[PDB]
Amino acid sequence: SRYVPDMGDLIWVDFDPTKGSAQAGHRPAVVLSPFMYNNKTGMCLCVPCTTQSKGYPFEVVLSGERDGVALADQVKSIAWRARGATKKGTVAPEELQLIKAKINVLIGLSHHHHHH
Amino acid sequence: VSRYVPDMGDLIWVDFHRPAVVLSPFMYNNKTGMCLCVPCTTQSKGYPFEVVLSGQEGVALADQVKSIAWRARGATKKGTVAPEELQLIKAKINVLIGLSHHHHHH
Amino acid sequence: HENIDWGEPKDKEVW
């Protein structure tokens, strides 16, 4: 039935109509979190894509239907179930892994066993 | 004078005020004027991504991680979270988007 | 919990 985002999906989401964006079309984004979480919560963690690279270090090039780069440090929770999401494609495994690898530098944890 | 720069583990108040826990390292926070943080809310509901901050007055919502322009917004320092609480927040995020777990799904 | 809303994006926040 309804599409449910899964990790690696390249989705389109609406520009939030309250935030004043002057951009045309939709906002592309890469889904990071797994299907099971996304399905259960109606949310997903994603990074946004832009058409213009600028050479910043958290940029990950996406090769593959529209040119783009994912901004790996700009992770956000997206309410796909309430606000909508459309699947346009999937990113390469290497690109998905690179995005997650970069994010780890911002959320690196300690190396020990614990309850979580 | 010289504005406060968030460090990893700091509990900050951000003009959105909204409390948040800063996850990203000082080096990143200082260079970019951005930080990766998690917002806090007033009450717990038993949602699994909640992390209760001890002990007065602090419930962090781990799955609502967000990059915030602390420098432009004007963040202030409320204190620092206990190491165990910081670790728990990070671990819960890691389950969802960590490279180590990625390979258990694909 | 509400989906936390940070209001108008600022500085280098893209969304």
Side-chain angles (χ1 to χ4, degrees), chain A residues 1-35 37-64 66 68-109 112-116, chain B residues 2 4-15 17-42 44-55 58-106, chain C residues 1-2 4-15:
Chain A
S1 48
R2 234 214 125 142
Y3 160 64
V4 177
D6 195 357
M7 72 175 71
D9 290 357
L10 184 67
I11 65 179
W12 279 7
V13 296
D14 307 299
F15 290 101
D16 185 324
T18 65
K19 301 192 178 315
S21 181
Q23 297 174 63
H26 289 72
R27 155 109 59 207
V30 184
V31 177
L32 302 185
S33 51
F35 175 82
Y37 168 88
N38 302 342
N39 186 48
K40 291 182 180 285
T41 65
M43 312 289 169
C44 59
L45 292 178
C46 298
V47 290
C49 296
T50 184
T51 189
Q52 311 280 332
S53 65
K54 299 183 197 292
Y56 284 78
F58 282 88
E59 290 175 7
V60 179
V61 171
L62 307 178
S63 30
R66 236 42 136 200
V69 308
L71 303 188
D73 57 342
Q74 300 269 312
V75 54
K76 186 179 70 171
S77 179
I78 295 298
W80 64 266
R81 194 168 65 194
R83 290 166 185 232
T86 301
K87 181 171 186 175
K88 303 297 281 192
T90 43
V91 309
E94 298 78 20
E95 298 160 349
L96 180 54
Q97 289 165 26
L98 183 52
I99 296 164
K100 293 185 171 177
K102 284 184 175 67
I103 284 169
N104 178 70
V105 170
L106 301 178
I107 63 176
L109 34 61
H112 67 88
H113 299 292
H114 62 94
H115 174 280
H116 64 282
Chain B
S2 311
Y4 155 70
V5 177
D7 194 8
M8 170 189 314
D10 284 4
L11 179 68
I12 69 176
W13 283 9
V14 167
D15 303 24
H17 92 72
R18 156 83 53 180
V21 180
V22 173
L23 309 180
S24 44
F26 174 92
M27 168 170 51
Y28 171 85
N29 303 339
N30 190 37
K31 192 182 310 198
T32 66
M34 307 290 281
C35 69
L36 205 61
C37 69
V38 300
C40 295
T41 187
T42 81
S44 62
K45 293 182 196 174
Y47 184 70
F49 287 88
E50 286 165 9
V51 175
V52 182
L53 310 179
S54 291
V59 178
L61 301 177
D63 64 346
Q64 302 208 33
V65 55
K66 175 89 173 116
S67 178
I68 291 299
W70 63 264
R71 192 163 71 198
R73 293 180 181 256
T76 59
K77 185 183 186 180
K78 182 61 185 175
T80 61
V81 174
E84 186 167 337
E85 293 177 350
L86 179 57
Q87 176 65 12
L88 188 50
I89 296 174
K90 287 181 174 205
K92 292 182 186 286
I93 297 165
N94 189 71
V95 167
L96 295 177
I97 62 168
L99 183 64
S100 303
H101 288 284
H102 169 82
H103 298 269
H104 290 327
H105 303 282
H106 95 223
Chain C
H1 301 281
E2 60 179 354
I4 299 309
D5 171 15
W6 296 85
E8 186 64 312
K10 301 275 296 184
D11 183 53
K12 297 180 294 297
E13 305 170 358
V14 301
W15 63 354

